[PDB]
PDB file of C-alpha atoms (C1' of nucleotides) and ligand atoms in Angstrom:
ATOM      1  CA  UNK B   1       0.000   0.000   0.000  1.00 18.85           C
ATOM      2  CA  UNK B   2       0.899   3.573  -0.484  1.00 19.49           C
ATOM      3  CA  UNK B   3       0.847   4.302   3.283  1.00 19.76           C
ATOM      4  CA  UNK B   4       3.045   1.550   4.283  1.00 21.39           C
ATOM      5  CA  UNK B   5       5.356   2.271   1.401  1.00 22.01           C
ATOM      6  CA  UNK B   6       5.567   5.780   2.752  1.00 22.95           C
ATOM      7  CA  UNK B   7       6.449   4.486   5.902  1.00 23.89           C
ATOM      8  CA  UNK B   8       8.445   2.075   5.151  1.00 25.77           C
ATOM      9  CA  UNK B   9      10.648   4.584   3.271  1.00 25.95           C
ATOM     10  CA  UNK B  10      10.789   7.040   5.987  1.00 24.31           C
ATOM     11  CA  UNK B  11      12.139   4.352   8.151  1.00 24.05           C
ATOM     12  CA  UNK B  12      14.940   2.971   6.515  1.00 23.01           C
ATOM     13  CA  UNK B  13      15.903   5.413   4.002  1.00 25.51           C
ATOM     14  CA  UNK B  14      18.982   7.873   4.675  1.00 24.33           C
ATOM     15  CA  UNK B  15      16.839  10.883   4.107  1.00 25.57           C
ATOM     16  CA  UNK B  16      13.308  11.611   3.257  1.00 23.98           C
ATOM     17  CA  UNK B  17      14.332  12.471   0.084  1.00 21.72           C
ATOM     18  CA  UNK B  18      16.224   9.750  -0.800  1.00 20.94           C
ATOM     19  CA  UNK B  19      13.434   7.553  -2.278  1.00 21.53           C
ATOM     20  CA  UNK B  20      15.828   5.300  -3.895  1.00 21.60           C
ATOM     21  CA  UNK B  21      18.340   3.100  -2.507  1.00 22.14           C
ATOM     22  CA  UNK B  22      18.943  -0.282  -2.174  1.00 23.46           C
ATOM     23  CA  UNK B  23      17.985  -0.585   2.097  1.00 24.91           C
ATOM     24  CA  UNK B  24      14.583   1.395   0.707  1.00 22.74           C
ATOM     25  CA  UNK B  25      13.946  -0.885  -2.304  1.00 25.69           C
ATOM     26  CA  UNK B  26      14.448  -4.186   0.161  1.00 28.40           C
ATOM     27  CA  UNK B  27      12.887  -3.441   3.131  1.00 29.71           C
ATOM     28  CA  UNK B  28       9.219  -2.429   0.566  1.00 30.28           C
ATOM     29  CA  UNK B  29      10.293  -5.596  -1.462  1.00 28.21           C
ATOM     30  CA  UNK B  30      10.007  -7.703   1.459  1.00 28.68           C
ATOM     31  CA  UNK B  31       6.679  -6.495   2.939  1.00 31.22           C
ATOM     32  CA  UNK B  32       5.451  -7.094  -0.511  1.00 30.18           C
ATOM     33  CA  UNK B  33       7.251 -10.456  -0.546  1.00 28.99           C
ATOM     34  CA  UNK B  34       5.462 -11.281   2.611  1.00 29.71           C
ATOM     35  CA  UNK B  35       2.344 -10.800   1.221  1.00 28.79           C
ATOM     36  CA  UNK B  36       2.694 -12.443  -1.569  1.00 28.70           C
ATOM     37  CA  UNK B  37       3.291 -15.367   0.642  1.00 29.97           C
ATOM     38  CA  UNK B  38       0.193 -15.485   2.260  1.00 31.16           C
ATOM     39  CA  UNK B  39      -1.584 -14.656  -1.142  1.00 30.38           C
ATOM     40  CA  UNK B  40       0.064 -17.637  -2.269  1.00 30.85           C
ATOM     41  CA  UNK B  41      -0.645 -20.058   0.729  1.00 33.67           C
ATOM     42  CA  UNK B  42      -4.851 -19.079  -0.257  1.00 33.34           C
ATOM     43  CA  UNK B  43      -4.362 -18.977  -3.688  1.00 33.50           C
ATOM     44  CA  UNK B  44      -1.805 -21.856  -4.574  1.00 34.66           C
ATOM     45  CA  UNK B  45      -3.182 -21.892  -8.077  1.00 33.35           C
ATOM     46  CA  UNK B  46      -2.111 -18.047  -9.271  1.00 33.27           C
ATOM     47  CA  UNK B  47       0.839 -19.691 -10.917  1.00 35.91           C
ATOM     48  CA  UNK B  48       0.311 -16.203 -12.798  1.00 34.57           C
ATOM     49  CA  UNK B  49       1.441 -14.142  -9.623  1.00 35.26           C
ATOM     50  CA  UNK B  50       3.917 -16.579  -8.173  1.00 36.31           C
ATOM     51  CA  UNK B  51       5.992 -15.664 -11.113  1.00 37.09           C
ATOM     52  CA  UNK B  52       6.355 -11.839 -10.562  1.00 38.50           C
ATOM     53  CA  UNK B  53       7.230 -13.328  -7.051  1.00 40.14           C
ATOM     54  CA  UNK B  54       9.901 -15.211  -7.715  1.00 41.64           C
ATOM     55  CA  UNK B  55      11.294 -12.038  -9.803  1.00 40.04           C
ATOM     56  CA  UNK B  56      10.710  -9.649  -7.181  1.00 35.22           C
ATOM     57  CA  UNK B  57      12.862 -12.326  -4.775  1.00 33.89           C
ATOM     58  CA  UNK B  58      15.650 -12.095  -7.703  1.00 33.21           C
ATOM     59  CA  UNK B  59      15.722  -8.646  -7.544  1.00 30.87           C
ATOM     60  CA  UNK B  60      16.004  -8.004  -3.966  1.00 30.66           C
ATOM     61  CA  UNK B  61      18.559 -10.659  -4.240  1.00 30.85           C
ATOM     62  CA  UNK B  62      20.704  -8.791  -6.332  1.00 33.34           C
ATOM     63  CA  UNK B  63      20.088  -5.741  -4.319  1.00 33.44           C
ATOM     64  CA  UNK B  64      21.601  -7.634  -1.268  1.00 34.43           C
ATOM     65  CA  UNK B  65      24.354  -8.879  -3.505  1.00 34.90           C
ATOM     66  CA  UNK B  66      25.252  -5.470  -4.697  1.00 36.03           C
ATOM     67  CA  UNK B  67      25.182  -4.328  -0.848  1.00 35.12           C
ATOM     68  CA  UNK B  68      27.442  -6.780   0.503  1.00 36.09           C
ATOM     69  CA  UNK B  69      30.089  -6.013  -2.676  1.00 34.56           C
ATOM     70  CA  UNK B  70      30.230  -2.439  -1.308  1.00 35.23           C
ATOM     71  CA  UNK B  71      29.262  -2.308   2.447  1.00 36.64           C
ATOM     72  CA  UNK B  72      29.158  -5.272   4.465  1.00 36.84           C
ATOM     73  CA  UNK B  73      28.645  -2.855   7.724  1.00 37.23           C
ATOM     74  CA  UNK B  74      25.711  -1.431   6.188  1.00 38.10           C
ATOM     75  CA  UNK B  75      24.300  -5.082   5.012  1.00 40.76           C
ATOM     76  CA  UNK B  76      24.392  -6.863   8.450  1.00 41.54           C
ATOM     77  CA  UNK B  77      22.773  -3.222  10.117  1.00 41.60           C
ATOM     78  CA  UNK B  78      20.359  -4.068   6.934  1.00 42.02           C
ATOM     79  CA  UNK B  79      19.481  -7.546   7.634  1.00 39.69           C
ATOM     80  CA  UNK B  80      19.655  -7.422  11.355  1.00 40.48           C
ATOM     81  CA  UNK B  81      17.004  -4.320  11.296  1.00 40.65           C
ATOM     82  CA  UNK B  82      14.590  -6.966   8.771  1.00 39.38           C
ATOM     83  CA  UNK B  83      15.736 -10.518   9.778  1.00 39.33           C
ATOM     84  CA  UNK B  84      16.214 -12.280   6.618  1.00 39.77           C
ATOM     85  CA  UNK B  85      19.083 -14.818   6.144  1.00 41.42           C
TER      86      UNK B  85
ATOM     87  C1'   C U   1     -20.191 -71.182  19.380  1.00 44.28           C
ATOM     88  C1'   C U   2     -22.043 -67.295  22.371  1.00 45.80           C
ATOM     89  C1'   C U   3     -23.833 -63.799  26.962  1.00 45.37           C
ATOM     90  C1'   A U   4     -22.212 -61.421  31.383  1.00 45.00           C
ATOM     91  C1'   U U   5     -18.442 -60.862  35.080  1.00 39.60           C
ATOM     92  C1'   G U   6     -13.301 -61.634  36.369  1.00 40.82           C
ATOM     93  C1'   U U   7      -8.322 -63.206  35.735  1.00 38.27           C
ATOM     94  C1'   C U   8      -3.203 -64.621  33.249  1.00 40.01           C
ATOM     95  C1'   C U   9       0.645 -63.647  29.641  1.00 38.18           C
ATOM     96  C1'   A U  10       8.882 -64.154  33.038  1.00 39.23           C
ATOM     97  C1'   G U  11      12.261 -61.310  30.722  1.00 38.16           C
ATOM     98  C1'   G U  12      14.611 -58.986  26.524  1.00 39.49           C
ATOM     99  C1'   U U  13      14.290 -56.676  21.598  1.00 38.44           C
ATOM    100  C1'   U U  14      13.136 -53.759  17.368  1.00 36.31           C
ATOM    101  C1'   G U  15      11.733 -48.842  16.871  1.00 33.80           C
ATOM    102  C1'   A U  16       5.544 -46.623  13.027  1.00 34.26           C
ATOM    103  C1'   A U  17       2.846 -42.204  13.442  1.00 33.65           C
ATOM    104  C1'   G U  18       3.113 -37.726  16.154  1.00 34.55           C
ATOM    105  C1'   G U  19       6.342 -33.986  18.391  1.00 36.14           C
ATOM    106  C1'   U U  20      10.827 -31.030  19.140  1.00 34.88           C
ATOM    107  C1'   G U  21      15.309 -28.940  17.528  1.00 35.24           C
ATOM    108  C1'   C U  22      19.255 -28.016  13.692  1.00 38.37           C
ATOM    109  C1'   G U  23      20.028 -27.515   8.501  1.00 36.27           C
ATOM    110  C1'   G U  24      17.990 -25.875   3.539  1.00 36.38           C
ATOM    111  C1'   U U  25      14.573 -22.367   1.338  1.00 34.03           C
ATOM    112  C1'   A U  26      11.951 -16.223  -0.557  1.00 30.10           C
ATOM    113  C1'   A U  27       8.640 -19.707   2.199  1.00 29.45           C
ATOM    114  C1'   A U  28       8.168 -24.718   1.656  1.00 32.16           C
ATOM    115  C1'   A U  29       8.715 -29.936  -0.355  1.00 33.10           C
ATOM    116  C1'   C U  30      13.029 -32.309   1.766  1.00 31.91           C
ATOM    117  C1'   G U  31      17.053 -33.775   4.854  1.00 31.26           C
ATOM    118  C1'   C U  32      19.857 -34.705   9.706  1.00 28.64           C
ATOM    119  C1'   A U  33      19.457 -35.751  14.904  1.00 29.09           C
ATOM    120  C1'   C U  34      16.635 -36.490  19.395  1.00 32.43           C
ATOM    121  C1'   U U  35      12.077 -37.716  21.787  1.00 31.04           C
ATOM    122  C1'   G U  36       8.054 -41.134  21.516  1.00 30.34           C
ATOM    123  C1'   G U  37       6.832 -46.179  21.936  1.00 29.57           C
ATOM    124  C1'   A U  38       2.963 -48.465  17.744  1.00 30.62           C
ATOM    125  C1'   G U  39       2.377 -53.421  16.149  1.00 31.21           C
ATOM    126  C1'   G U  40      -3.492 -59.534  14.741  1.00 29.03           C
ATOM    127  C1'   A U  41       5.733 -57.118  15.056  1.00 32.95           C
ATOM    128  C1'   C U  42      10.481 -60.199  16.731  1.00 33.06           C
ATOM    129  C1'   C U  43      13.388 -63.858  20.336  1.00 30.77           C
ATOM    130  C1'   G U  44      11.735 -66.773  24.245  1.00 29.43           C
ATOM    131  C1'   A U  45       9.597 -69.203  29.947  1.00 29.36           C
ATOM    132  C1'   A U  46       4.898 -70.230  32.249  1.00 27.78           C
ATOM    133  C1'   C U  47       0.019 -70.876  29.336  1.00 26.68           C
ATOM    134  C1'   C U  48      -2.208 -72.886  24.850  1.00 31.84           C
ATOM    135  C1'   C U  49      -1.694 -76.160  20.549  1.00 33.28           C
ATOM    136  C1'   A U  50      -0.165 -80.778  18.451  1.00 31.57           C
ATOM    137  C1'   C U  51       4.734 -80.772  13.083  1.00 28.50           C
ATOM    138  C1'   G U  52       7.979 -84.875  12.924  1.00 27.48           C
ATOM    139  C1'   U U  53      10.372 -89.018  14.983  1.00 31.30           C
ATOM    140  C1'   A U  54      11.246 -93.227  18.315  1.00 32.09           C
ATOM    141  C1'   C U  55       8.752 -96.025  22.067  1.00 31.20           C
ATOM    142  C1'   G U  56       4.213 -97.901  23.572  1.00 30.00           C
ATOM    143  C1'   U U  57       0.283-100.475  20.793  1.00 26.95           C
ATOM    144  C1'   U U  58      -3.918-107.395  25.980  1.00 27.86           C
ATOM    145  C1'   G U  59      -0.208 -99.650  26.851  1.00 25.25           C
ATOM    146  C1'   A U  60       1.774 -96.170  33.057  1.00 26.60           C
ATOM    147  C1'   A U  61      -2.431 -94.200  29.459  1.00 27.43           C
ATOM    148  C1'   A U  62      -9.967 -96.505  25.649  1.00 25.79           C
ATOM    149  C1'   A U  63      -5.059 -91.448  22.187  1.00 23.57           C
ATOM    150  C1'   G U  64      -0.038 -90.859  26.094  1.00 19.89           C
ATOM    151  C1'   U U  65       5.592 -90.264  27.202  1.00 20.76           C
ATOM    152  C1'   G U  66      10.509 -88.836  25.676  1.00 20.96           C
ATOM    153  C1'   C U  67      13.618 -86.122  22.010  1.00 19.76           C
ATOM    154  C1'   G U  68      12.985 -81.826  19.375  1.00 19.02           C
ATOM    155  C1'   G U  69       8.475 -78.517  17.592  1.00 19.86           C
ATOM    156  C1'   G U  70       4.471 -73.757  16.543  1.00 18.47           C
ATOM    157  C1'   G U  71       1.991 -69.411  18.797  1.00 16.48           C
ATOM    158  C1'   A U  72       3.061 -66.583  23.012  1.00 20.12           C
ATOM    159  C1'   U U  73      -0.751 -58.176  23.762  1.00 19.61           C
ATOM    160  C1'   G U  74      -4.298 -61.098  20.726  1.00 20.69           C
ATOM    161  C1'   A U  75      -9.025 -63.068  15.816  1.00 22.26           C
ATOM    162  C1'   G U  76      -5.121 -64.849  22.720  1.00 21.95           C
ATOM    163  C1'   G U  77      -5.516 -68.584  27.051  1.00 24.64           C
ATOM    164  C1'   U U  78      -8.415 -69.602  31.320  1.00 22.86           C
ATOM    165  C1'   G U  79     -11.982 -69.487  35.534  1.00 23.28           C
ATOM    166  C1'   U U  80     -17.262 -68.906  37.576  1.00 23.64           C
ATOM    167  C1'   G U  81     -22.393 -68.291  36.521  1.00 23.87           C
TER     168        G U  81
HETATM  169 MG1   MG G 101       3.234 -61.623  17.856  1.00 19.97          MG
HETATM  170 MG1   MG G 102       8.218 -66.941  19.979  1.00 22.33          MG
HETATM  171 MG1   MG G 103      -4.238 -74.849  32.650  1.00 21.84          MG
HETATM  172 MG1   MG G 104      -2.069 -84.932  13.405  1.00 20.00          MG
END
RNA sequence: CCCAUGUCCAGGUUGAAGGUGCGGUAAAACGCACUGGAGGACCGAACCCACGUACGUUGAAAAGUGCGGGGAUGAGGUGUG
């Protein structure tokens, strides 16, 4: 949702302005992720949706990838504050 | 054969489901350990049955004994009424 996106930004972005960035773009990723989830667990037919899933999941992978090539300080302070793997 | 009401099955063993934890995952299938303790499951006394063999065969016995044998928490054995 728009509201929790705005939060969500707010939160773990560097500024308010600074909309992009790779914390910003994980930490909505993963609330969407989540929901998707649950989505999927009651609908375990929407092959359709699973798909654009499984390529959000890529790209926040290659997000995290990207962080831990340039800041491994700022990745663990990432992934302790969301508490993926 | 059945009704009701009771009672008996030394000991040991194996280790189903379920559960927990650790991996693995985006989350799961899944895997690794531990727990748990199932079974007309296993070995084997009493208990029950009678596979073979020898002997007995005017028998110790109008159906047995010995040497081994099968089942042994179950569709079990047994008692009283
Ligand atoms: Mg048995
Ligand atoms: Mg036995
Ligand atoms: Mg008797
Ligand atoms: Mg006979």
């Amino acid at each position: 949702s728009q509201e929790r996106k705005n939060e969500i930004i707010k939160e773990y972005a560097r500024h308010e302005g600074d909309t992009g960035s790779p914390e910003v773009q994980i930490a909505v990723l993963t609330e969407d992720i989540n929901q998707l989830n649950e989505h999927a667990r009651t609908h375990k037919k929407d092959h359709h949706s699973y798909r654009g899933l499984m390529k959000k999941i890529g790209h926040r992978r290659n997000l995290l990838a990207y962080l831990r090539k340039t800041d491994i300080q700022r990745y663990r302070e990432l992934i302790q504050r969301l508490g993926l793997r």
